[PDB]
Structures are given as C-alpha cells and as structure tokens.
Amino acid sequence: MFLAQEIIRKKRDGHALSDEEIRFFINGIRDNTISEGQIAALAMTIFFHDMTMPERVSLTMAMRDSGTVLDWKSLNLNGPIVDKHSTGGVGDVTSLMLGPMVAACGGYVPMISGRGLGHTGGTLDKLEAIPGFDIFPDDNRFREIIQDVGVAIIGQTSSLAPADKRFYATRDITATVDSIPLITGSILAKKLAEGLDALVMDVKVGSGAFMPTYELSEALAEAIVGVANGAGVRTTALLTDMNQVLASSAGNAVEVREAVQFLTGEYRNPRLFDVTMALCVEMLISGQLAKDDAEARAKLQAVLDNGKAAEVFGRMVAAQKGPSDFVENYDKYLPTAMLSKAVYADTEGFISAMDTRALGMAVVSMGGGRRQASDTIDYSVGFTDMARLGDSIDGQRPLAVIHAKDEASWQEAAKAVKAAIILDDKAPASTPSVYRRITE
Amino acid sequence: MFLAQEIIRKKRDGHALSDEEIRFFINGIRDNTISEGQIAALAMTIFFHDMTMPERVSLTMAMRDSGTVLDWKSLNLNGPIVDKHSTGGVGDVTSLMLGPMVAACGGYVPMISGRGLGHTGGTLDKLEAIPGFDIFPDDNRFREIIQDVGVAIIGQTSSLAPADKRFYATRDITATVDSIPLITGSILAKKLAEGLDALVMDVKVGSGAFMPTYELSEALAEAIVGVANGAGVRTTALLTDMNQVLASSAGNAVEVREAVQFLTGEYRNPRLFDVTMALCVEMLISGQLAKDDAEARAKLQAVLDNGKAAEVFGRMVAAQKGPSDFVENYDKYLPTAMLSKAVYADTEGFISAMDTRALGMAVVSMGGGRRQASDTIDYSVGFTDMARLGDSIDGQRPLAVIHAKDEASWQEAAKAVKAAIILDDKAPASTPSVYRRITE
C-alpha cells in the first residue's frame, strides 16, 4: 500500500496510460519500488490490450531515460551519430563490417551491442575471440575511439536503460515476452540512450528469427520504425532472410575471420553482402551522408574496394587493445579448433529447408555460447563453408565444415546439422535476402 | 541464364502463350531470375494484346501456384471451402458477419486477408481491436479452427502468390496496372491459393469504388468470373453500392461492435443487410449448400434469428485467443474513445451525396488507420450513427457521432465530415444496395 496499483487496473480495463503513469511505473521498476507481481500483471494487461503510439513512445523514452543517455554534442563531430540493431540470427556478422564501412564514409557509430541469447550468437562474444580486445572501455576511452576511429563495439554498463533488466527478466518467466509494444521498448531503449541521430533496424525473417512468421516480423519492424522516429531518431528497418546461416560461417573466431576477408575483398558471401550493403545504405541516407541508394552504394562500395573499411576495422581493433596488425595477420591471432571436418548428407537432393534455430543451438552445445554465467566460451568452435538453400548436394558436396573440441562434440554437431538440413528432389523457390525496406 | 526474351517476343507479335511458357515466366518473377525490364516488357505486350481465356487462366493459376496452395483433402471435411473477396470500401464490415453466417450454414471459410492501406481500412485491423484476438495463428492451428469452428480470419498472406509482388511493383511504375487480365490474376491469385471450391467477388460500383464506371465494374466482374471458373473454382460476382458508407460505422472497434449487433439482431443496417445477405447467398449456391436464392436466404435468416451465426463468430473469436464471452460482453472488451460526440451540419437539408474516400481519410487522420505503414492504429476512434443519403438534416439530426482520442482531433474530424457530406434543399433519389448478379 505504498502506491498506485491503479496503473494496472486502468490498462486491465482497456484504457490508455499516460506519459506520467508510464514514467512513474518504469522508474519504479528500476528503483525496486514496484514488485515482480505488479510488473508481471502490467505486462499481461499490455499483452491482451495493445498500447497506442503515444503509449509506445512514452514507454521507450521512459525506459531510455531510466539510465544514462549519451550526449555527443560536447565533441564537435561534423558527422551523424548512427547505429544498427538486429533481432539476431545465425552467422549474422554484418555489424563487424557495417560499423567500419559507415565510419569510413563519415559516420560516427557508437555500437553498444550484446552477447549471445538462446540460439543466436552475439557480436561481443565474436569480438572477444580477438586476443586483447576490450569491450568495456570507460566513458572517456569510448569518446576518444569514436572521435578518432569513428566506430567502436562495446558492452553495456548497469546504467544503460536499467529498467529493462527487471522488466525483461519478469516477462521471460511470465509468458509476456511475446508482445510487440514490449519488445519494441526493450529493443529501442538501449539503442536510443546511445544518443543517436539515426538508426537502421534489421528484423530477421524465417526459421532462425525472433518472430515465427513474416507478417509478425513485419509488424515488429513497423512498430520499431514508428516508435523510434516518434522519439526523434530518424529510423528505417529492413526485413532480412534468416531461413539459413547468413555468413558462410557460424560461431565466433570463424565469423571474425569471415568479416575481415569480406572487408579486404578476399571473399564476400553474396547473401551476406546484399544484407550488409542495404543496412549500410540506410545509415547513410538517414545520417545525411547520402541522398539516395545509388549515391550511398557508390560510397560504400568505394570504401570496400579501396581498403578504407578494412583499415578502419584494424584501427578499431587496435583502439580497443586488440593487436595493431589484426587485419594483416588475423590467422596468427584467431584461435583454431582441435577438430575440423566436413559433414555429409545421406541423400542426393537440393537443399530445401534449413532449421536455423537448431543450427544456432548446435553451436552453443559445442561451446560457442554460454548457458550459465560461469561457463566460458570456446571461441574456435562452429561451422564454416556452409552449403546454401538451393544448392545441389551429393557425396563430395559437404553441408558444412564443423569445428569442435573433440570427437564426441563433433559427432553431436554432425547429427544436429544433418537433422537440420532437409533435401528435396526438385529445386526449391529462391527467396530474396532482403524482403522490404520500411520508412516513416 | 534463362532469359525469356523469346516469350516477350512471341507475346509482342500477337501470339497466345502456352501454359508452360506462362508458368516459366511467373516462376522467373518469383525467383528474380527474370529482370524488371523483362517483366515490364511483357506487361506492356499484355496491355496491348490482351489475353485469351486460356492465357488468363494459365496466368492466374501460375501466380496461384507460385507459392503455397492450401490442401484440405485430409481432414475429410464434408462441406465446401468457400470465401468472399472484395474490391473494398468505407464501412464495409461484411466479412465479419459473412464468414460466421456461411459457416453456420455448413461452409468452411478460410478467410486470409491482406493488410489495409489507403482510404479504406482493413478487415485485419478491425479484428485486432478485440483484445487477445490473434490474426496470426500457425497454419496447423488454422486448419484446426477451420475444422472445429468452420471459419477463421487470419493474415498469413506472404507465402501466397508471391510472384504478384514484383509483378505489381513493376506494373505500378510502367503504366501497366490498368489491364484487365493483369488486374484479374492479381485480384484472384492469393484467394485461389486458399484452395477454394467456391468464391464470390464483391465488385463495388460508385464514386467510392475501385473501378470508376458502372460499365468498368461490370467488365472487371465478368473477367473475374470467367477466369475463376476456368481455374476450376465455382465463382459468381455481385455489383454492390459504394456511393456512401455501407455500415452505420467506420473505424475499427466501432465496426466490430456493428458486426456483433448485426449477428445478434441488436442492430441491422438495412443497406449493409442487403449486401451481406446477397453475398452469403452466392456462397451458399456456388458452395452447393443451397439450391437457389430463396432456400439460401431462409438458411441465412435462420442462423441470424436463432443466434447460431453470432455463436460461430464467438467461437471464432475464442479460437483466435479472444475472450470466449465476447458476444455477450463486447462493450466490456472493445476500446472506447476518450471523446464521443455528435457532429451537426452547418446547414439544413437532405443528404444529397457523400465523399466516401474523404470520410475514410478523416478516420485515418483520427488515428483509425495508417497514413503510412509505420503508423500505429488507435482502434477506438471512428464514426457511428452515420447519416445516410436522403436523410433529412437539421440541428436535431446529426451527420454522425465522432469518436476521437481528444477534442482537437474531434474538431479536425468534424470539419472533414462536414466537408465530405453534401446537403440539398430537395431530396435525392434512392439507388439499390445490390446491383447485377454475374454468373457468366
């Protein structure tokens, strides 16, 4: 009887909440002045009754103002503050190239990222395959890197939209994760506290995605776009394919290798390129570094093709206490698995479907992802040379190369892979890697 | 690799294309193995040469076959799979009653809709005003519902006729939209992908219609009937009136409320009753659930009178995760606007005409639809108690009651409504709600 359980009653009876009520409640979530039950009751009312635009905005802005909001106006940068966020996937390495690419074109990109969640890998866990790489700089150190290099990829401190900690933790035991306005707030609060001028969202589609279906993924994308621009951050979103691994590799070191090769030009997975380039195009248009697609793409391609984006990545890595020559000598630095060999299908058809959640899970079980705070990632495990949806497969066309700690691990991943890839006699229909662009 | 410049040339030179050439080209659109120039060139040759029935049929079947086509043969249902399709309109809530009504009479009605944008609102938006109501069940749940309830209204449209995406997109920048065989394939493909035995097409006539003249509505309607039956789906079409709002309401929650009251008998707008009834009749006859018009109407009137049609809507709602007592207690669940208030005309007279698009736009401006796909809907706003053509107007008889989120939007809406409705000293003449029934 310390205060208004009144906010819950109002939403329960289908009434819109107000800016103040929302701020009040989100503040109380942080302060622990509102209990788990109360949070869970409000979540469930929101699940049933969907929030309006002003409620959605007020929810995100409240969650963003619950901790520290980064202010960049102190340094006179003469370039937009732009970021990318993804709902996650398998082989979703794009950021490693994207931040550098955008930095190379005048962008300033303070990428506060996260670690692995469930089946999806995390950018921070990938970067921590690099010896010496420090994902926790000080506010001071961070500013410097961004100012000099133009990009950095770091982990969150407790003071970044901290309301989300209690809020999400409650949702995740109360079957209240699956609500679009609550997902939107949870996604964007962290990102908007970075003090952005602009943002692109990558909302995955298909078997390895967050949402189960295209239409739901689409719905979440428009909601993010609506809310973010509502908060005063120019935003667009793309709907991208995740019915298979996006890179040709899944894991940590292997993905880092792939990122470096893409930037230099040694190898570029054409699907990974399409998605990376498009996401990049958005940041340039929204950041006012380009006025259209064509002009964005020529500036982006140029920095892929003149070595500038590779260079910025090397400098970033060095700025964050990774080696000074990581790009030049990465394979001297990245850890290697004890055991690497192809896994082969039992049939001769075309690849028809790929269960990407399960592939992601398989990488975790090998050690490529945590399940308990204390257990430490083996950074060398994962898949490379991924076969792709539509490929003809036979006795000398492997589904993947699996990198593992030992035989037993290897066998476990081998069966998981074989189980996850389904083969047809006739070729399946092509799907685009980028489905749709979404603007305000 | 597999350009189809030969196919374009053959069509260009005034030859009929074979089913196999048509399927090849459409599947090439889907898989992006055919380029936009090529799609455009073929669209133009079709605009110029038209298509024979065989070609029209091959075209829409190929678009239909380009994605998923639902198979009902297992489940052993002892009735017809049937649906309604429409060109759309303001206050056209028919689907909400028609589905339950036909399913109460023995039909199975897998109502899959597309998302509504433009001056006229969507069926899916309206249902989502019901808390809990899930427009995106998984296809296995979907078939359960069709089996247990007989009707379900969902949104999983993406994997249906996906070739239409690039086709229409292209058509829409090259002035090849306005072509009857192309329009017909586009209108019909997604709906035939439902695996229908039978279909009715509602083609609107009037100032509010997708086609501009009575003669053009009729021409479209005959083309749709010719093709659908050639495609092996028993189809008829009706021309129905859109010179004013069909229902007495326009919005989301307001239109669901009208749908429930129509099913229960609490209120039946006579114009909306005529259209709804006529459409359901066709469905019963084409579905082979009624012998003729009089039998069909007796069956429908009976499910309206004994509450069975309202019960089915209730069971549909519960199946789709809505509250199970929604029909009894809809006012408890439907969101209510902060401000609901009558708007009166600046003059006295008879209602002479109404600009339905402007009225639809007024609802959209209230928040009752999407200006852009980014936007969030406020499900509570809209119009009720709509005055109708021929009504006498003065300071005792309002134009409508406006449900707005605040006074300023109400005022905005009140101006727009007043501008949209034309009064006159002398009363206008009446027209039918339902025009020609087309069986070809």
Side-chain angles (χ1 to χ4, degrees):
Chain A
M1 208 305 185
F2 32 69
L3 39 67
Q5 89 174 256
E6 222 65 30
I7 295 173
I8 291 168
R9 193 172 292 110
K10 198 176 192 179
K11 196 84 202 163
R12 181 206 70 185
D13 293 343
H15 306 118
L17 303 173
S18 77
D19 184 50
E20 284 81 14
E21 287 167 307
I22 297 159
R23 297 277 274 145
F24 179 101
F25 211 104
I26 297 304
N27 284 176
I29 290 182
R30 194 228 302 110
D31 295 332
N32 278 78
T33 56
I34 299 184
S35 76
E36 188 186 274
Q38 305 201 286
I39 292 161
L42 177 74
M44 197 55 80
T45 67
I46 288 166
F47 175 92
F48 294 137
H49 308 80
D50 205 318
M51 277 181 149
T52 59
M53 188 62 86
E55 279 178 293
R56 286 178 176 202
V57 181
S58 303
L59 173 60
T60 299
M61 280 179 65
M63 285 193 288
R64 167 193 56 103
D65 299 332
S66 75
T68 177
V69 180
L70 297 178
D71 181 74
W72 298 100
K73 289 124 61 203
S74 308
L75 329 165
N76 191 204
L77 282 180
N78 221 203
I81 323 303
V82 291
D83 208 345
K84 186 273 285 177
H85 180 86
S86 169
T87 68
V90 175
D92 184 36
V93 65
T94 72
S95 292
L96 289 197
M97 297 91 81
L98 166 144
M101 279 159 80
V102 178
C105 292
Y108 289 97
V109 185
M111 210 176 328
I112 308 170
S113 186
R115 311 168 166 288
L117 192 300
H119 68 278
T120 77
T123 302
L124 297 180
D125 293 330
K126 296 165 192 190
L127 285 166
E128 272 183 330
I130 308 182
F133 194 90
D134 186 23
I135 62 172
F136 303 115
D138 294 16
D139 261 61
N140 326 94
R141 190 81 202 88
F142 192 44
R143 281 190 148 206
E144 290 181 326
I145 305 159
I146 298 311
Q147 193 177 68
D148 295 335
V149 173
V151 56
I153 316 169
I154 74 165
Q156 320 183 231
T157 63
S158 287
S159 202
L160 205 99
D164 195 36
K165 177 189 184 170
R166 288 263 287 158
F167 207 168
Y168 182 85
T170 312
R171 294 172 43 198
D172 195 48
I173 59 166
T174 61
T176 291
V177 183
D178 200 13
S179 156
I180 274 161
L182 301 173
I183 295 166
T184 299
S186 197
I187 283 312
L188 284 172
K190 296 171 171 187
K191 303 309 285 178
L192 304 166
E194 304 174 348
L196 304 183
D197 287 321
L199 170 62
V200 65
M201 180 68 39
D202 187 0
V203 182
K204 302 298 191 189
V205 173
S207 64
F210 202 88
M211 304 304 305
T213 62
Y214 180 96
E215 302 304 339
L216 276 165
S217 292
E218 187 171 37
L220 170 60
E222 29 213 7
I224 290 151
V225 166
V227 176
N229 282 286
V233 168
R234 192 110 49 192
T235 302
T236 65
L238 302 166
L239 268 60
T240 68
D241 194 272
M242 196 43 64
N243 281 297
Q244 64 180 317
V245 191
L246 179 57
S248 290
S249 63
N252 291 106
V254 301
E255 291 201 43
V256 173
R257 175 167 287 107
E258 179 149 3
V260 174
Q261 292 188 190
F262 172 111
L263 289 165
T264 63
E266 288 175 62
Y267 175 69
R268 288 170 180 163
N269 171 124
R271 293 185 70 261
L272 178 64
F273 177 84
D274 285 342
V275 178
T276 308
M277 184 48 84
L279 285 170
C280 281
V281 168
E282 295 309 311
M283 306 174 61
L284 264 59
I285 303 173
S286 307
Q288 285 186 271
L289 297 179
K291 68 146 70 182
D292 48 71
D293 187 54
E295 187 193 26
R297 290 184 105 94
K299 290 160 88 95
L300 291 160
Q301 192 71 43
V303 298
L304 273 307
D305 290 0
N306 67 16
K308 289 264 178 193
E311 297 175 20
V312 292
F313 179 69
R315 308 207 294 123
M316 188 193 78
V317 161
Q320 297 192 61
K321 296 159 63 192
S324 49
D325 65 329
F326 184 74
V327 164
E328 292 91 358
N329 287 310
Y330 62 84
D331 50 344
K332 286 185 171 180
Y333 293 114
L334 262 28
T336 302
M338 198 137 298
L339 191 54
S340 310
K341 21 172 196 167
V343 55
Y344 297 95
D346 294 325
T347 296
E348 203 141 49
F350 294 89
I351 294 175
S352 174
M354 209 158 103
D355 180 3
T356 313
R357 173 182 305 281
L359 291 175
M361 287 316 291
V363 177
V364 169
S365 304
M366 306 173 81
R370 296 167 317 272
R371 207 182 294 270
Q372 39 169 159
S374 177
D375 86 71
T376 53
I377 283 178
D378 180 348
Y379 293 97
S380 73
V381 301
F383 314 125
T384 56
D385 310 345
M386 282 304 312
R388 300 206 291 273
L389 282 173
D391 293 345
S392 175
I393 297 281
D394 63 336
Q396 64 267 310
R397 176 77 74 81
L399 293 170
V401 174
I402 299 176
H403 304 265
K405 286 170 161 90
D406 48 65
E407 257 288 301
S409 246
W410 192 92
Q411 232 72 232
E412 208 75 46
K415 293 275 185 152
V417 173
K418 291 203 272 197
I421 283 90
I422 282 152
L423 291 91
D424 286 355
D425 279 339
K426 272 75 173 292
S430 309
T431 45
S433 61
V434 180
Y435 288 94
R436 177 158 183 247
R437 184 187 94 107
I438 299 152
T439 329
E440 206 210 352
Chain B
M1 172 60 182
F2 290 75
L3 301 303
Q5 189 184 185
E6 299 197 321
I7 292 159
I8 292 161
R9 186 175 296 117
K10 177 169 175 185
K11 195 56 197 166
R12 190 200 65 188
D13 286 350
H15 304 286
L17 302 169
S18 70
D19 186 62
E20 73 199 296
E21 291 162 345
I22 283 155
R23 300 179 72 85
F24 164 86
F25 203 103
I26 292 308
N27 280 351
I29 304 193
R30 164 192 74 190
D31 297 347
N32 193 77
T33 43
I34 303 181
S35 79
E36 170 189 298
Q38 291 184 310
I39 300 161
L42 182 80
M44 201 44 92
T45 69
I46 295 164
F47 183 100
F48 193 80
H49 282 304
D50 206 329
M51 274 178 158
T52 64
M53 202 57 36
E55 293 179 284
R56 283 178 183 194
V57 176
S58 300
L59 174 55
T60 86
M61 294 186 316
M63 287 165 87
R64 188 248 282 135
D65 281 349
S66 78
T68 322
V69 313
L70 302 171
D71 186 308
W72 308 96
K73 291 303 141 79
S74 59
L75 276 47
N76 282 37
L77 306 166
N78 294 61
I81 300 104
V82 200
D83 208 354
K84 183 264 281 183
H85 192 30
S86 180
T87 60
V90 187
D92 178 336
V93 69
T94 59
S95 307
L96 261 57
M97 301 93 70
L98 168 149
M101 279 167 85
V102 170
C105 288
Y108 296 90
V109 198
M111 302 204 26
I112 304 176
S113 294
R115 191 50 77 81
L117 277 94
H119 49 98
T120 65
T123 303
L124 302 170
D125 293 337
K126 301 152 148 77
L127 286 168
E128 221 167 340
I130 305 176
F133 191 94
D134 181 30
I135 67 176
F136 305 121
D138 55 281
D139 64 74
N140 184 222
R141 179 56 191 169
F142 179 55
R143 52 187 43 240
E144 266 201 72
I145 300 172
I146 294 303
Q147 200 167 33
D148 303 323
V149 183
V151 52
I153 308 188
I154 78 176
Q156 265 84 21
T157 191
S158 64
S159 61
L160 303 189
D164 191 31
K165 282 323 96 210
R166 283 185 80 228
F167 210 165
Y168 180 85
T170 303
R171 289 171 52 213
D172 204 27
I173 51 156
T174 56
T176 59
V177 173
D178 191 5
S179 164
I180 274 207
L182 294 182
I183 288 174
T184 305
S186 183
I187 282 181
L188 224 39
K190 301 193 162 60
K191 276 291 176 195
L192 300 185
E194 306 176 341
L196 305 173
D197 298 297
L199 171 68
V200 61
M201 183 69 199
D202 180 355
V203 175
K204 312 304 197 164
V205 170
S207 50
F210 165 62
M211 221 60 62
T213 67
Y214 179 103
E215 268 184 299
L216 285 164
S217 303
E218 181 178 40
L220 181 65
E222 289 173 338
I224 296 155
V225 170
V227 176
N229 282 287
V233 183
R234 201 167 296 292
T235 303
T236 67
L238 303 193
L239 312 177
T240 76
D241 186 272
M242 277 309 315
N243 292 105
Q244 58 177 311
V245 191
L246 220 209
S248 289
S249 54
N252 294 274
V254 292
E255 280 189 51
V256 170
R257 194 182 194 259
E258 173 143 4
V260 174
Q261 297 203 319
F262 175 112
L263 292 174
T264 63
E266 291 161 293
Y267 177 66
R268 292 170 180 148
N269 170 300
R271 294 184 73 263
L272 178 69
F273 179 74
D274 285 352
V275 176
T276 303
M277 276 282 265
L279 293 166
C280 289
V281 166
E282 294 308 293
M283 287 176 74
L284 263 37
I285 300 161
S286 296
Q288 283 162 171
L289 289 174
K291 196 198 169 203
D292 56 43
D293 175 75
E295 166 148 288
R297 300 174 84 105
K299 287 168 172 294
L300 297 153
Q301 195 81 334
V303 294
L304 284 178
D305 294 331
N306 76 355
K308 280 291 181 184
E311 175 173 80
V312 173
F313 178 86
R315 299 216 305 123
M316 184 191 80
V317 161
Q320 302 196 230
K321 310 193 190 75
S324 73
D325 61 331
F326 182 74
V327 178
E328 311 95 285
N329 288 290
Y330 52 86
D331 277 312
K332 180 194 166 177
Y333 295 110
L334 285 177
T336 322
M338 308 310 182
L339 179 61
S340 177
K341 174 165 60 161
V343 59
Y344 295 87
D346 296 332
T347 328
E348 294 200 355
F350 293 96
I351 294 185
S352 149
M354 278 173 38
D355 183 336
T356 63
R357 308 169 300 111
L359 290 163
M361 285 316 298
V363 181
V364 165
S365 301
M366 267 183 300
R370 282 177 214 76
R371 292 180 152 192
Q372 211 76 210
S374 179
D375 298 329
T376 293
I377 293 169
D378 182 340
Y379 297 106
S380 82
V381 305
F383 308 142
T384 56
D385 300 63
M386 278 296 322
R388 299 205 291 275
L389 298 179
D391 289 352
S392 199
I393 291 306
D394 57 22
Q396 296 299 111
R397 312 158 178 274
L399 295 176
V401 34
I402 300 170
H403 306 243
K405 72 167 203 165
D406 55 39
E407 171 70 345
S409 52
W410 192 95
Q411 229 70 41
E412 196 176 61
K415 291 199 184 220
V417 162
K418 234 165 274 210
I421 301 169
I422 294 155
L423 304 182
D424 194 288
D425 311 61
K426 297 315 202 87
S430 54
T431 74
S433 298
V434 176
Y435 304 90
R436 183 184 167 204
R437 165 189 180 231
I438 295 156
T439 62
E440 314 298 71

